[PDB]
PDB file of C-alpha atoms and ligand atoms in Angstrom:
ATOM      1  CA  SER U   1       7.613  10.537  10.570  1.00  0.00           C
ATOM      2  CA  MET U   2       7.636   7.458  12.009  1.00  0.00           C
ATOM      3  CA  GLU U   3      11.089   7.123  14.242  1.00  0.00           C
ATOM      4  CA  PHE U   4      13.067   3.702  15.407  1.00  0.00           C
ATOM      5  CA  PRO U   5      15.399   2.793  17.783  1.00  0.00           C
ATOM      6  CA  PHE U   6      17.533   1.844  14.695  1.00  0.00           C
ATOM      7  CA  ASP U   7      19.105   3.024  11.831  1.00  0.00           C
ATOM      8  CA  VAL U   8      16.500   3.186   9.222  1.00  0.00           C
ATOM      9  CA  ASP U   9      18.410   4.661   6.422  1.00  0.00           C
ATOM     10  CA  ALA U  10      21.630   1.908   7.086  1.00  0.00           C
ATOM     11  CA  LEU U  11      19.037  -0.541   6.592  1.00  0.00           C
ATOM     12  CA  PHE U  12      16.975   1.016   3.183  1.00  0.00           C
ATOM     13  CA  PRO U  13      19.517   2.149   1.441  1.00  0.00           C
ATOM     14  CA  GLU U  14      16.573   3.262  -1.896  1.00  0.00           C
ATOM     15  CA  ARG U  15      14.178   5.484  -0.832  1.00  0.00           C
ATOM     16  CA  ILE U  16      11.438   2.912  -2.136  1.00  0.00           C
ATOM     17  CA  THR U  17      11.933  -0.401  -0.283  1.00  0.00           C
ATOM     18  CA  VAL U  18       9.937  -3.357  -2.073  1.00  0.00           C
ATOM     19  CA  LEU U  19       9.311  -6.528   0.626  1.00  0.00           C
ATOM     20  CA  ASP U  20       7.771 -10.103   0.424  1.00  0.00           C
ATOM     21  CA  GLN U  21       7.096 -12.876   2.371  1.00  0.00           C
ATOM     22  CA  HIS U  22      10.607 -13.595   2.800  1.00  0.00           C
ATOM     23  CA  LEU U  23      11.152  -9.965   4.253  1.00  0.00           C
ATOM     24  CA  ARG U  24      14.796  -9.740   2.397  1.00  0.00           C
ATOM     25  CA  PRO U  25      17.201  -7.096   3.901  1.00  0.00           C
ATOM     26  CA  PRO U  26      18.437  -5.268   1.502  1.00  0.00           C
ATOM     27  CA  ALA U  27      22.060  -5.505   0.042  1.00  0.00           C
ATOM     28  CA  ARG U  28      23.820  -4.904   1.363  1.00  0.00           C
ATOM     29  CA  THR U  29      27.289  -4.756  10.447  1.00  0.00           C
ATOM     30  CA  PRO U  30      24.049  -5.880  11.819  1.00  0.00           C
ATOM     31  CA  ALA U  31      23.296  -9.982  11.765  1.00  0.00           C
ATOM     32  CA  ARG U  32      20.591 -10.896   9.152  1.00  0.00           C
ATOM     33  CA  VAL U  33      18.304 -11.946  11.886  1.00  0.00           C
ATOM     34  CA  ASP U  34      18.318  -8.517  13.190  1.00  0.00           C
ATOM     35  CA  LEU U  35      17.685  -6.570   9.967  1.00  0.00           C
ATOM     36  CA  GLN U  36      15.174  -8.995   9.168  1.00  0.00           C
ATOM     37  CA  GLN U  37      13.424  -7.869  13.174  1.00  0.00           C
ATOM     38  CA  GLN U  38      13.934  -4.499  11.805  1.00  0.00           C
ATOM     39  CA  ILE U  39      11.557  -4.869   8.804  1.00  0.00           C
ATOM     40  CA  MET U  40       9.541  -6.597  11.048  1.00  0.00           C
ATOM     41  CA  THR U  41       8.987  -3.399  13.545  1.00  0.00           C
ATOM     42  CA  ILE U  42       8.234  -1.109  10.834  1.00  0.00           C
ATOM     43  CA  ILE U  43       5.563  -3.332   9.203  1.00  0.00           C
ATOM     44  CA  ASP U  44       3.961  -3.831  12.539  1.00  0.00           C
ATOM     45  CA  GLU U  45       3.792  -0.178  13.313  1.00  0.00           C
ATOM     46  CA  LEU U  46       2.969   0.809  10.206  1.00  0.00           C
ATOM     47  CA  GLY U  47       0.145  -1.272  10.196  1.00  0.00           C
ATOM     48  CA  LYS U  48      -0.950   0.224  13.591  1.00  0.00           C
ATOM     49  CA  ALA U  49      -0.879   3.564  12.486  1.00  0.00           C
ATOM     50  CA  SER U  50      -2.741   2.421   9.307  1.00  0.00           C
ATOM     51  CA  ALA U  51      -5.733   0.858  11.185  1.00  0.00           C
ATOM     52  CA  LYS U  52      -5.595   3.724  13.727  1.00  0.00           C
ATOM     53  CA  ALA U  53      -6.474   6.286  11.196  1.00  0.00           C
ATOM     54  CA  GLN U  54      -8.997   4.038   9.712  1.00  0.00           C
ATOM     55  CA  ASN U  55     -10.880   3.346  12.395  1.00  0.00           C
ATOM     56  CA  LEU U  56     -10.148  -0.505  12.827  1.00  0.00           C
ATOM     57  CA  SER U  57     -10.497  -2.766  15.507  1.00  0.00           C
ATOM     58  CA  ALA U  58      -7.187  -4.656  14.500  1.00  0.00           C
ATOM     59  CA  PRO U  59      -3.808  -3.915  12.236  1.00  0.00           C
ATOM     60  CA  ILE U  60      -4.936  -5.598   8.455  1.00  0.00           C
ATOM     61  CA  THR U  61      -1.430  -5.287   8.378  1.00  0.00           C
ATOM     62  CA  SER U  62       1.835  -6.925  10.212  1.00  0.00           C
ATOM     63  CA  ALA U  63       4.369  -8.668   9.627  1.00  0.00           C
ATOM     64  CA  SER U  64       3.431 -12.552  10.441  1.00  0.00           C
ATOM     65  CA  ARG U  65       0.283 -11.810   8.173  1.00  0.00           C
ATOM     66  CA  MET U  66       2.596 -10.354   5.619  1.00  0.00           C
ATOM     67  CA  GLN U  67       4.469 -13.610   5.367  1.00  0.00           C
ATOM     68  CA  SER U  68       1.662 -16.414   5.779  1.00  0.00           C
ATOM     69  CA  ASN U  69      -0.336 -13.940   2.996  1.00  0.00           C
ATOM     70  CA  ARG U  70       1.839 -13.650   0.051  1.00  0.00           C
ATOM     71  CA  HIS U  71       1.194  -9.764  -0.284  1.00  0.00           C
ATOM     72  CA  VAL U  72       3.792  -7.098  -1.092  1.00  0.00           C
ATOM     73  CA  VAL U  73       4.749  -3.754   0.573  1.00  0.00           C
ATOM     74  CA  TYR U  74       6.707  -0.904  -1.103  1.00  0.00           C
ATOM     75  CA  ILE U  75       8.005   1.381   1.753  1.00  0.00           C
ATOM     76  CA  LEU U  76       8.508   4.699   1.246  1.00  0.00           C
ATOM     77  CA  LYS U  77      11.786   6.697   3.919  1.00  0.00           C
ATOM     78  CA  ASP U  78      12.214  10.041   4.642  1.00  0.00           C
ATOM     79  CA  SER U  79      14.471  12.172   2.983  1.00  0.00           C
ATOM     80  CA  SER U  80      14.248  15.405   4.983  1.00  0.00           C
ATOM     81  CA  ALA U  81      16.698  14.802   8.109  1.00  0.00           C
ATOM     82  CA  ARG U  82      14.913  14.186  11.364  1.00  0.00           C
ATOM     83  CA  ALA U  83      18.492  13.130  15.382  1.00  0.00           C
ATOM     84  CA  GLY U  84      19.802  11.311  11.807  1.00  0.00           C
ATOM     85  CA  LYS U  85      18.819   7.964  12.412  1.00  0.00           C
ATOM     86  CA  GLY U  86      16.261   8.588   9.387  1.00  0.00           C
ATOM     87  CA  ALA U  87      12.916   7.836   9.465  1.00  0.00           C
ATOM     88  CA  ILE U  88       9.939   6.266   7.397  1.00  0.00           C
ATOM     89  CA  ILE U  89       6.791   8.069   5.800  1.00  0.00           C
ATOM     90  CA  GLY U  90       4.517   5.517   4.487  1.00  0.00           C
ATOM     91  CA  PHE U  91       3.372   1.791   2.553  1.00  0.00           C
ATOM     92  CA  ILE U  92       1.089   0.404   0.015  1.00  0.00           C
ATOM     93  CA  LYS U  93       0.691  -3.131   0.197  1.00  0.00           C
ATOM     94  CA  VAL U  94      -1.036  -4.860  -2.771  1.00  0.00           C
ATOM     95  CA  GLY U  95      -2.141  -8.385  -3.559  1.00  0.00           C
ATOM     96  CA  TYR U  96      -3.820 -11.158  -6.213  1.00  0.00           C
ATOM     97  CA  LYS U  97      -7.351 -12.126  -4.891  1.00  0.00           C
ATOM     98  CA  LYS U  98      -9.681 -14.622  -5.933  1.00  0.00           C
ATOM     99  CA  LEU U  99     -13.252 -11.990  -6.278  1.00  0.00           C
ATOM    100  CA  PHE U 100     -16.604 -12.005  -7.488  1.00  0.00           C
ATOM    101  CA  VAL U 101     -16.938  -8.531  -9.075  1.00  0.00           C
ATOM    102  CA  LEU U 102     -20.780  -7.161 -10.334  1.00  0.00           C
ATOM    103  CA  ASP U 103     -20.197  -5.734 -13.582  1.00  0.00           C
ATOM    104  CA  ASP U 104     -22.442  -3.327 -15.209  1.00  0.00           C
ATOM    105  CA  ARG U 105     -25.056  -5.864 -15.556  1.00  0.00           C
ATOM    106  CA  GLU U 106     -25.244  -7.078 -12.144  1.00  0.00           C
ATOM    107  CA  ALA U 107     -23.476  -9.979 -13.234  1.00  0.00           C
ATOM    108  CA  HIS U 108     -21.167 -11.497 -11.150  1.00  0.00           C
ATOM    109  CA  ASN U 109     -17.757 -12.239 -12.522  1.00  0.00           C
ATOM    110  CA  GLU U 110     -15.322 -14.482 -10.937  1.00  0.00           C
ATOM    111  CA  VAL U 111     -11.544 -12.446 -11.645  1.00  0.00           C
ATOM    112  CA  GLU U 112      -7.825 -12.250  -9.700  1.00  0.00           C
ATOM    113  CA  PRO U 113      -6.814  -8.814 -10.063  1.00  0.00           C
ATOM    114  CA  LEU U 114      -4.391  -7.027  -8.538  1.00  0.00           C
ATOM    115  CA  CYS U 115      -5.997  -5.318  -5.026  1.00  0.00           C
ATOM    116  CA  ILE U 116      -4.777  -2.284  -3.121  1.00  0.00           C
ATOM    117  CA  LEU U 117      -4.932  -3.774   0.229  1.00  0.00           C
ATOM    118  CA  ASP U 118      -3.543  -0.826   2.537  1.00  0.00           C
ATOM    119  CA  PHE U 119      -2.440   2.441   2.345  1.00  0.00           C
ATOM    120  CA  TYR U 120      -1.241   4.950   4.278  1.00  0.00           C
ATOM    121  CA  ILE U 121       1.402   8.208   4.404  1.00  0.00           C
ATOM    122  CA  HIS U 122       2.085  10.125   7.998  1.00  0.00           C
ATOM    123  CA  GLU U 123      -0.754  11.961   8.904  1.00  0.00           C
ATOM    124  CA  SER U 124       2.107  15.151   9.526  1.00  0.00           C
ATOM    125  CA  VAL U 125       3.011  14.795   5.942  1.00  0.00           C
ATOM    126  CA  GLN U 126      -0.135  13.966   3.653  1.00  0.00           C
ATOM    127  CA  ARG U 127      -0.768  16.265   0.449  1.00  0.00           C
ATOM    128  CA  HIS U 128       2.978  16.874  -0.213  1.00  0.00           C
ATOM    129  CA  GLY U 129       2.892  14.171  -2.405  1.00  0.00           C
ATOM    130  CA  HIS U 130       4.173  11.336  -1.250  1.00  0.00           C
ATOM    131  CA  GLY U 131       0.954   9.189  -1.754  1.00  0.00           C
ATOM    132  CA  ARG U 132       1.558   9.663  -5.863  1.00  0.00           C
ATOM    133  CA  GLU U 133       4.907   8.985  -5.665  1.00  0.00           C
ATOM    134  CA  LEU U 134       4.752   5.628  -3.903  1.00  0.00           C
ATOM    135  CA  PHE U 135       1.512   4.589  -5.853  1.00  0.00           C
ATOM    136  CA  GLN U 136       3.264   5.918  -9.181  1.00  0.00           C
ATOM    137  CA  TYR U 137       6.558   3.497  -8.058  1.00  0.00           C
ATOM    138  CA  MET U 138       4.071   0.269  -7.725  1.00  0.00           C
ATOM    139  CA  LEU U 139       1.914   0.487 -10.770  1.00  0.00           C
ATOM    140  CA  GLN U 140       5.510   0.564 -12.803  1.00  0.00           C
ATOM    141  CA  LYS U 141       6.690  -2.121 -10.498  1.00  0.00           C
ATOM    142  CA  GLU U 142       3.248  -4.007 -10.788  1.00  0.00           C
ATOM    143  CA  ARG U 143       2.642  -3.863 -14.539  1.00  0.00           C
ATOM    144  CA  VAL U 144      -0.769  -2.382 -14.120  1.00  0.00           C
ATOM    145  CA  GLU U 145      -2.612   0.349 -15.258  1.00  0.00           C
ATOM    146  CA  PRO U 146      -4.900   2.131 -12.136  1.00  0.00           C
ATOM    147  CA  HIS U 147      -8.405   0.944 -13.919  1.00  0.00           C
ATOM    148  CA  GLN U 148      -7.509  -2.669 -13.396  1.00  0.00           C
ATOM    149  CA  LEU U 149      -7.095  -2.040  -9.519  1.00  0.00           C
ATOM    150  CA  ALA U 150      -9.227  -3.730  -7.252  1.00  0.00           C
ATOM    151  CA  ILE U 151      -9.779  -1.642  -4.240  1.00  0.00           C
ATOM    152  CA  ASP U 152     -10.617  -2.740  -0.579  1.00  0.00           C
ATOM    153  CA  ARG U 153     -12.344  -0.384   1.580  1.00  0.00           C
ATOM    154  CA  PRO U 154     -10.956   2.264   0.581  1.00  0.00           C
ATOM    155  CA  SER U 155     -11.618   5.732   2.248  1.00  0.00           C
ATOM    156  CA  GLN U 156     -13.050   9.427   0.754  1.00  0.00           C
ATOM    157  CA  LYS U 157      -9.166  10.320   1.351  1.00  0.00           C
ATOM    158  CA  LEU U 158      -8.274   7.677  -1.416  1.00  0.00           C
ATOM    159  CA  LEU U 159     -11.117   8.076  -3.587  1.00  0.00           C
ATOM    160  CA  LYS U 160     -10.409  11.561  -4.113  1.00  0.00           C
ATOM    161  CA  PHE U 161      -7.017  10.895  -4.679  1.00  0.00           C
ATOM    162  CA  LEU U 162      -7.168   8.587  -7.467  1.00  0.00           C
ATOM    163  CA  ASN U 163      -9.881  10.871  -9.448  1.00  0.00           C
ATOM    164  CA  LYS U 164      -6.942  13.237  -9.202  1.00  0.00           C
ATOM    165  CA  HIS U 165      -4.275  11.256  -9.880  1.00  0.00           C
ATOM    166  CA  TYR U 166      -5.315   8.967 -12.542  1.00  0.00           C
ATOM    167  CA  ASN U 167      -8.763  10.323 -13.516  1.00  0.00           C
ATOM    168  CA  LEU U 168     -10.807   7.297 -12.018  1.00  0.00           C
ATOM    169  CA  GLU U 169     -14.248   8.673 -10.982  1.00  0.00           C
ATOM    170  CA  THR U 170     -17.093   6.197 -12.190  1.00  0.00           C
ATOM    171  CA  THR U 171     -17.464   3.120 -10.020  1.00  0.00           C
ATOM    172  CA  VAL U 172     -19.581  -0.220 -10.724  1.00  0.00           C
ATOM    173  CA  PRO U 173     -21.933  -1.005  -7.835  1.00  0.00           C
ATOM    174  CA  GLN U 174     -20.380  -3.862  -5.315  1.00  0.00           C
ATOM    175  CA  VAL U 175     -21.247  -5.470  -3.094  1.00  0.00           C
ATOM    176  CA  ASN U 176     -18.167  -7.126  -1.519  1.00  0.00           C
ATOM    177  CA  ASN U 177     -16.520  -3.824  -0.056  1.00  0.00           C
ATOM    178  CA  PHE U 178     -13.856  -3.791  -3.201  1.00  0.00           C
ATOM    179  CA  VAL U 179     -14.306  -0.687  -5.385  1.00  0.00           C
ATOM    180  CA  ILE U 180     -13.909  -1.582  -9.145  1.00  0.00           C
ATOM    181  CA  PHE U 181     -14.061   1.977 -11.761  1.00  0.00           C
ATOM    182  CA  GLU U 182     -15.351   1.773 -15.436  1.00  0.00           C
ATOM    183  CA  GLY U 183     -12.700   0.194 -17.309  1.00  0.00           C
ATOM    184  CA  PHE U 184     -11.807  -2.623 -14.898  1.00  0.00           C
ATOM    185  CA  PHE U 185     -14.038  -4.984 -17.281  1.00  0.00           C
ATOM    186  CA  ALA U 186     -12.269  -3.601 -20.650  1.00  0.00           C
TER     187      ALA U 186
HETATM  188  C1  COA D   1      -5.435   8.139   0.951  1.00  0.00           C
HETATM  189  C2  COA D   1      -3.301   8.561   1.139  1.00  0.00           C
HETATM  190  C3  COA D   1      -2.324   7.422   1.377  1.00  0.00           C
HETATM  191  C4  COA D   1      -2.854  10.008   0.643  1.00  0.00           C
HETATM  192  O1  COA D   1      -1.689   9.779   0.527  1.00  0.00           O
HETATM  193  P1  COA D   1      -1.450  11.324   0.113  1.00  0.00           P
HETATM  194  O2  COA D   1       0.339  11.707   0.612  1.00  0.00           O
HETATM  195  O3  COA D   1      -2.041  12.365   1.271  1.00  0.00           O
HETATM  196  O4  COA D   1      -1.399  11.864  -1.504  1.00  0.00           O
HETATM  197  P2  COA D   1      -0.899  12.882  -2.118  1.00  0.00           P
HETATM  198  O5  COA D   1      -0.139  14.164  -1.170  1.00  0.00           O
HETATM  199  O6  COA D   1       0.081  12.083  -3.174  1.00  0.00           O
HETATM  200  O7  COA D   1      -2.437  13.283  -3.577  1.00  0.00           O
HETATM  201  C5  COA D   1      -3.181  14.372  -2.346  1.00  0.00           C
HETATM  202  C6  COA D   1      -4.365  13.671  -3.386  1.00  0.00           C
HETATM  203  O8  COA D   1      -5.207  13.064  -2.192  1.00  0.00           O
HETATM  204  C7  COA D   1      -6.243  13.452  -1.994  1.00  0.00           C
HETATM  205  N1  COA D   1      -5.990  13.498  -0.631  1.00  0.00           N
HETATM  206  C8  COA D   1      -5.283  13.437   0.392  1.00  0.00           C
HETATM  207  N2  COA D   1      -6.344  13.727   1.720  1.00  0.00           N
HETATM  208  C9  COA D   1      -6.653  14.388   1.743  1.00  0.00           C
HETATM  209  C10 COA D   1      -8.189  14.713   2.734  1.00  0.00           C
HETATM  210  N3  COA D   1      -7.306  15.058   4.354  1.00  0.00           N
HETATM  211  N4  COA D   1      -9.165  15.272   1.865  1.00  0.00           N
HETATM  212  C11 COA D   1      -9.426  14.831   0.694  1.00  0.00           C
HETATM  213  N5  COA D   1      -8.557  14.698   0.406  1.00  0.00           N
HETATM  214  C12 COA D   1      -7.385  14.244   0.213  1.00  0.00           C
HETATM  215  C13 COA D   1      -6.635  14.778  -2.500  1.00  0.00           C
HETATM  216  O9  COA D   1      -7.120  14.860  -4.140  1.00  0.00           O
HETATM  217  C14 COA D   1      -5.216  15.542  -2.586  1.00  0.00           C
HETATM  218  O10 COA D   1      -5.351  16.775  -3.559  1.00  0.00           O
HETATM  219  P3  COA D   1      -5.877  17.690  -3.419  1.00  0.00           P
HETATM  220  O11 COA D   1      -4.787  18.121  -2.160  1.00  0.00           O
HETATM  221  O12 COA D   1      -5.129  18.453  -4.675  1.00  0.00           O
HETATM  222  O13 COA D   1      -7.005  18.173  -2.784  1.00  0.00           O
HETATM  223  C15 COA D   1      -3.570   9.639   2.820  1.00  0.00           C
HETATM  224  O14 COA D   1      -4.042  10.682   2.514  1.00  0.00           O
HETATM  225  C16 COA D   1      -3.589   8.339   3.403  1.00  0.00           C
HETATM  226  O15 COA D   1      -2.446   7.549   4.668  1.00  0.00           O
HETATM  227  N6  COA D   1      -4.605   8.751   4.379  1.00  0.00           N
HETATM  228  C17 COA D   1      -4.815   7.194   5.070  1.00  0.00           C
HETATM  229  C18 COA D   1      -5.451   6.122   5.000  1.00  0.00           C
HETATM  230  C19 COA D   1      -6.426   5.990   3.991  1.00  0.00           C
HETATM  231  O16 COA D   1      -7.052   6.445   4.135  1.00  0.00           O
HETATM  232  N7  COA D   1      -6.033   4.824   3.213  1.00  0.00           N
HETATM  233  C20 COA D   1      -7.003   4.321   2.494  1.00  0.00           C
HETATM  234  C21 COA D   1      -7.749   3.071   2.378  1.00  0.00           C
HETATM  235  S1  COA D   1      -6.868   1.880   2.421  1.00  0.00           S
END
């Protein structure tokens, strides 16, 4: 898992930490502005590792993008003992987006669903249930059911994940790089 030049455990007391555009350090020695920079470094590095895994020319997640857009990230820290300064396992980034979405009749619909915009679990610990734990937490906090989500450019791994954990299989064909499932328009 990803290690940093600072104490991750002190920075993030909870196993899953929710952050928005304000990048607020969880409550409660280092100055607030310095804690905020630590958070920014974490988000930047997570964004980079995700991008490299998805073969992207540039990250779609970074600290600066987070603030200027108004997206929300959920960050899962490592529960095992790695030195002793803690570590980060992965994250999921969500946000509402206005989209034109095709239905089963091939008509375009104006909608604004919650979208899964980025999602990454460290390669070394994938397939150990971390992705499900993070996803479940996000669902409970965001108050949405899985079939109401739009998924941005999902990988084959993520499609298999959604079918396994949430029985999401049947898609409604789109032209815009988002994926939606049957029941989205329900
Ligand atoms: C997608 C991802 C977040 C899944 O998280 P995870 O912690 O591996 O997921 P979990 O352990 O909770 O769930 C495991 C299930 O996910 C799916 N999955 C995970 N890794 C997989 C792989 N290498 N091949 C096929 N399916 C996979 C499978 O359905 C798997 O179930 P199985 O092991 O019974 O086949 C993680 O694989 C990842 O970071 N992938 C790279 C980034 C990415 O693809 N993001 C999606 C585009 S935004």
